[PDB]
Amino acid sequence: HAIFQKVSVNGADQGSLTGLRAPNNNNPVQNVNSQDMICGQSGSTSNTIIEVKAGDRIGAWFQHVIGGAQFPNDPDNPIAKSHKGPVMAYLAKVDNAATASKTGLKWFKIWEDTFNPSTKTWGVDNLINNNGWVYFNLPQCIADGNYLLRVEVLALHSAYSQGQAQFYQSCAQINVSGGGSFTPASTVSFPGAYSASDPGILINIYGATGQPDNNGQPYTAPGPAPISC
Ligand SMILES: [Cu+2]
């Protein structure tokens, strides 16, 4: 139960919900065909378009509730330790980030922190270790102009049952400067890219004693592979 609710560019805190299309509530989206799977549920929107340069270090801040922790010593801030799973980042080219409809956009994945079989660590584990933040670099090669940056936590604690995997989502409205000439080799539709019966969505991640280690097996994240320049 968390909400990506704040961007940071090379450390520069862009402000709570500045240029964010983010849910009001922290309830999970579980129907992978739902329109809520693009930028999460409808709720907060913004008129800001975050000015970034191709290559910048984007940090995305997840917290239990809007504002941060729901109460002093909140055990589920930034997210509950049980919510093991990957975190994923997509881009989609638009004319005007502020106006653009979230529907029908051609998405492409730029980054993912999935699972490490050896160290037994998930994307969410790093999320928590980084006090809610998730850092990644915007690819150098992408072409200038407006994008929707779509960061997405996938929690797989109950994902052993069909349609019980949990998706947490939000979109930063951004604009890219000092870019290249990379158009994606292929794109994916949202909703559409994820199938409920995927190895990464329908999956039991619990080992013998019941620890969420995926029996030290390599996780296969949903959607396309991250791009490369
Ligand atoms: Cu939850």
**Residue 190 falls inside a structural domain:** yes
Listed residue (210, 200, 215) closest to 118, CA to CA:
215
**Residue 226 falls inside a structural domain:** no
Helix %, strand %, coil % for the chain, to 5?
5, 35, 60
Residue 107 is part of which domain span? 3-216
CA of 119 to the centre of ligand 1 (A): 24
**Residue 93 falls inside a structural domain:** yes
CATH number of residue 160's parent domain:
2.70.50.70
Domain count, the chain: 1
**Residue 162 falls inside a structural domain:** yes
**β-pair partners for 57:** 137
CA of 229 to the centre of ligand 1 (A): 35
Distance CA 208, CA 44 (A): 42
Distance CA 101, CA 111 (A): 23
Two tokens, residue 169 = 């989502």
**Residue 145 falls inside a structural domain:** yes
Q: What is the stated resolution of the deposited model, in angstroms? A: 3.0
| CA dihedral of 24, 26, 27, 31, whole degrees rounded to 10 | 80
Residue 160 annotated in ligand binding: no
CA of 177 to the centre of ligand 1 (A): 36
Give the DSSP H/E element, type plus range, for residue 22: strand 20-23
Amino acid, res. 37: M
Distance CA 58, CA 138 (A): 7
Two tokens, residue 200 = 């990464």
Residue 157 annotated in ligand binding: no
Experimental method: X-ray
**Residue 221 falls inside a structural domain:** no
